[PDB]
Ligand binder design. Structure first.
Ligand SMILES: *C(=N)[C@H](C[C@@H]1CCNC1=O)NC(=O)[C@@H]1[C@@H]2[C@H](CN1C(=O)[C@@H](NC(=O)C(F)(F)F)C(C)(C)C)C2(C)C
Ligand SMILES: *C(=N)[C@H](C[C@@H]1CCNC1=O)NC(=O)[C@@H]1[C@@H]2[C@H](CN1C(=O)[C@@H](NC(=O)C(F)(F)F)C(C)(C)C)C2(C)C
Lengths: 306, 306
């Protein structure tokens, strides 16, 4: 029993972190094979960050202007290219610790582990969800850029995120490992808005199923509803509209507990309309939306990795 | 900015996990140097767990009754001893991945990372606090025993916990790495009570300081209090009594924010007496007590590890 927010083991990603310095600016890089990936704003000064022209700024840089360091060991840079907002530095040495990996673009609602890094060294690991507004709720300070997000599929590390910036509301923004930002964000120190953040409904239902599995089920009322009537109520609370695809993904949880998705939707409706009354669910006084149906199944089975 | 519950990177501990089988019972072991450590109830059958006599049960076991497996590789057991509730199996091969380590007994209120394991393979990592009642709020299923808790001090892994059992209220219990349980718990399948769980006051104050650091400070009232008047109110809410040692540990946070500990105590008093009114602090509708002053400082600086 017990339900906790859990990150994937980070060992396979720890071996891929390096420190990338250009001028005075130092950040983290991801060393896979003979390529190091980092945010392209490593070439900027503080002044440049205000309105950068990355092409012109990069045109003044050679391979020798990039200091790539793995522990107390320097890697020799023999190539460099800008791919969208990421800089790829080709090095003469392949990472002997390169795991089986792939680059993926995660969808909103999906979760991933973040290994927060400073000066190429891991500081900590935590779980995040890609919000519907393409922001994350992380914990990143100066030097954290280049810290990556990932999932583990038994032996294969799937990289999905690279940290670039923090927005005015305290939330975070970054790119996939090809350099494309999630959301409308740009890598420039200029005022940018995240936009209305909605609640990942399928994840809230998955979290209600974990609560039921773990004996916590006071919220289960005797009512039921329809997808359109539930959606009509959920949109009033800024909840993402539940679809038949979402219903099918909740399938294994619905089967393991004997509770129809539409019955669980009606209990969610009464929780949204009447609140929690100071009571808790899994030790929380709010409805939690950062656990996918897969996160709940993995934890209610104990899925292990290599 | 941003404040998240963060586990230490788990790579150094991943290399120490092995699978220990005795009869049909399989659990996790911690392989450091030429010794493997696991819960002594690996020698029990389901029936034995009801009222075990570990000495007599162990007396029927030889080195060859213990199957120790690292990946798809068997370790040859050449010695075995019971140290309190842990079984230590001496193997012919030292772990080539043994990091710099030490065994420590943590105090209540202190936190640590748990690398949850099944069949010797890591499944996930999360942070826990040793409650004042010597229980933890984990996420452990069948096979999770032998999963360990640890802290990292730059290069040195400090092992402080080994999982053994789950109590009736869903909470967890285990031992240090010498086999002594935290709390009054025994490794026997018999009804056992955790006892009244109190709130780690110094940690709640540390979490209020992280909230202030991260711009969240609505709760800051214009009142102040004394240690005895605050304690008189905190004991009514099952809060651990704040001491001058606690005040001194909050020092760096008090200095970084310009807020006296006793002023922060008065705001905590009004939060306990009048509630949060549906408002949140760091995205939480409850007062959080699983972040020590050290956890807050580490995150509001970005302390990194080897
Ligand atoms: C990279 N190490 C940091 C990560 C930041 C540091 C504070 N917390 C973080 O997440 N990235 C930056 O400092 C980026 C960088 C220039 C400005 N910057 C920002 O994150 C700024 N944000 C913005 O201007 C905004 F709102 F548009 F996102 C900052 C004001 C420092 C928070 C570049 C190139 C975007
Ligand atoms: C070891 N792999 C498991 C971990 C358990 C499995 C479910 N979640 C956990 O934390 N340890 C056990 O199954 C231990 C083991 C016998 C019984 N057991 C328990 O945890 C039981 N608890 C108790 O009887 C109680 F309340 F006293 F703690 C159980 C009923 C299965 C929860 C031994 C030797 C203690």
């Amino acid at each position: 029993s017990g339900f906790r927010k859990m990150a994937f083991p980070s060992g396979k990603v720890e071996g891929c972190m390096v420190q990338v310095t250009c001028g005075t600016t130092t950040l983290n890089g991801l060393w896979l094979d003979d390529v190091v990936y980092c945010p392209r704003h490593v070439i900027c000064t503080s002044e440049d960050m205000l309105n950068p022209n990355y092409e012109d700024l990069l045109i003044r840089k050679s391979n020798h202007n990039f200091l790539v360091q793995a522990g107390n060991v320097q890697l020799r840079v023999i190539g460099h290219s800008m791919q969208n907002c990421v800089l790829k530095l080709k090095v003469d040495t392949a990472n002997p610790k390169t795991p089986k990996y792939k680059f993926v673009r995660i969808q909103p609602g999906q979760t991933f582990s973040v290994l927060a890094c400073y000066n190429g060294s891991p500081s900590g690991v935590y779980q995040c969800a890609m919000r519907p507004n393409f922001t994350i709720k992380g914990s990143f300070l100066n030097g954290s850029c280049g810290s990556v997000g990932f999932n583990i599929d038994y032996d294969c590390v799937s990289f999905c995120y690279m940290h670039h910036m923090e927005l005015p509301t305290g939330v975070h923004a970054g790119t996939d490992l090809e350099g494309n930002f999630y959301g409308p964000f740009v890598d420039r120190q200029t005022a940018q808005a995240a936009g209305t953040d909605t609640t990942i409904t399928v994840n809230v239902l998955a979290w209600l199923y974990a609560a039921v599995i773990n004996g916590d089920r006071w919220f289960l009322n005797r009512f039921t509803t329809t997808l359109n009537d539930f959606n009509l109520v959920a949109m009033k609370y800024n909840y993402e509209p539940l679809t038949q695809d979402h219903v099918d993904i909740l399938g294994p949880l619905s089967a393991q507990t004997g509770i129809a998705v539409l019955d669980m939707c009606a209990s969610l409706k009464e929780l949204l309309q009447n609140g929690m009354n100071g009571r808790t669910i899994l030790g929380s006084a709010l409805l939690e939306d950062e656990f996918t149906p897969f996160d709940v199944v993995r934890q209610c089975s104990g899925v292990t990795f290599q």
